[PDB]
Design a protein around this ligand. Sequence first.
Ligand SMILES: OC[C@H]1O[C@H](O[C@H]2[C@H](O)[C@@H](O)[C@@H](O[C@H]3[C@H](O)[C@@H](O)[C@@H](O)O[C@@H]3CO)O[C@@H]2CO)[C@H](O)[C@@H](O)[C@@H]1O
Length: 476
Amino acid sequence: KKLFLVFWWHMHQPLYREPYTGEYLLPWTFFHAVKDYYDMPAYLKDFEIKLNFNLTPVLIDQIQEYAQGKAKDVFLEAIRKDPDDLEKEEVEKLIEFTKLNYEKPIYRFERIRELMNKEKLNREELLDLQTLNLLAWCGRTLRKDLKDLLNKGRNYTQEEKEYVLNKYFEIIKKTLSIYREIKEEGKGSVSTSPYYHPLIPILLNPNCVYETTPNVKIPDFAVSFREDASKHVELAKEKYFEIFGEHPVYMWPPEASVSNEALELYYEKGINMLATDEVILKNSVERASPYLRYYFRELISVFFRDKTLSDLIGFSYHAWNAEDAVRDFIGRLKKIHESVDFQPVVFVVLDGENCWEYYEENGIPFLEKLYSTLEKEEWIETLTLEEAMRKEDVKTEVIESVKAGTWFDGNFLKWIGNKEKNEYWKILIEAKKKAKNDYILVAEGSDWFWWQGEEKAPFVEVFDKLFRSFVRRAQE
Ligand SMILES: OC[C@H]1O[C@H](O[C@H]2[C@H](O)[C@@H](O)[C@@H](O[C@H]3[C@H](O)[C@@H](O)[C@@H](O)O[C@@H]3CO)O[C@@H]2CO)[C@H](O)[C@@H](O)[C@@H]1O
């Protein structure tokens, strides 16, 4: 009797490329590429387990632009320059960026503490500020290769900074290749999402928000987004085809969002399996275990992720010591294993790049211990998405209807329903009336609405600038 374990790491960035200047207005794609997008599948070189990945098409587009040397990244330019060449505005961006990231464990360099304590920085001090911002995002592979420079922690030269930059771009250039390789070697499956990561159930039918939040106020959806919902899925299939040579059969629905209409669309588009969230399952059927493979109307296969295990990694374990965290997680798996006669399928699905910066040492002690432990547990079998989809010795059940929702509380309130988020939908609705090109699809991405009308929102003015630029470009 085995427990089947399925990791599915979701990787995504909205488009930071301003359409009129071509400049990347935030560096987050660059920094998550050098820290997470190569290194997460690269664990499979060292550990004999299966790990699965979702890559959104808009993320793939940007990785390609960086790897080709075409990304005009404004924050990265302030890092690369000799400090004597920095504009006053660029120094201010560097300090601002440091300040935002300052409390993250990956920024735990004594020299950063000293630099942010100085009234003004000379050329040598700015060289350190630039280089330590780069090194803070060093991924697992180069933390071993560049170990000597990392332990330096201060006194960086322009030549050392440029050397680190060159190694980082090497990592980016190898990123799509590592995904093809782990896919071809059978170490993992690779999925994609509708192209710009939109909320497909809202595009198909805005009134689906009233399935879970009857009191929410939404704007007048005076235009149809149904054809755009189809286009997101179709263009995603073409982009995945271009990278991997075949059409995708697995998709990750953005925000785990599903509805009856969305499931039908994925089915009509040839998708064979997706996953969603445990809260959706609980809202949709009275009694339902998440350890079964489900069949929606006998049209498409659905797994419901284990929300507890997924949230422990994604939100809890950064606050734990690495060994205790792994012991806790293995112990929960043991309880699941002992709780049923059949062989359960346990889906662990979460963002693949966002939690690690809050762990000690970028989550590397945690993940190395977790994977090293999992690979020697004889009663656990990690599975690719393809293996999970075809596994015969598993329990299954047919479901006829789901209640629309997302993995955030089972509902859509993080993207619609307050004044500021509703203003964005009205802008999109009015723009959709006059849209002339596919930049209207870019503005349909979920990220723009997520940051609107929120308290934190680092660089929300940049996201607002991007959203409104795409909305303006779509009408020309
Ligand atoms: O400056 C704000 C914020 O920007 C960057 O966050 C990006 C994430 O790194 C990226 O993964 C993506 O996050 C979305 C997930 O893919 C998605 O599944 C869901 O959880 O919502 C997220 C937001 O829409 O996009 C965001 C930007 O939208 C940067 O990395 C953060 O550090 C920074 O705080």
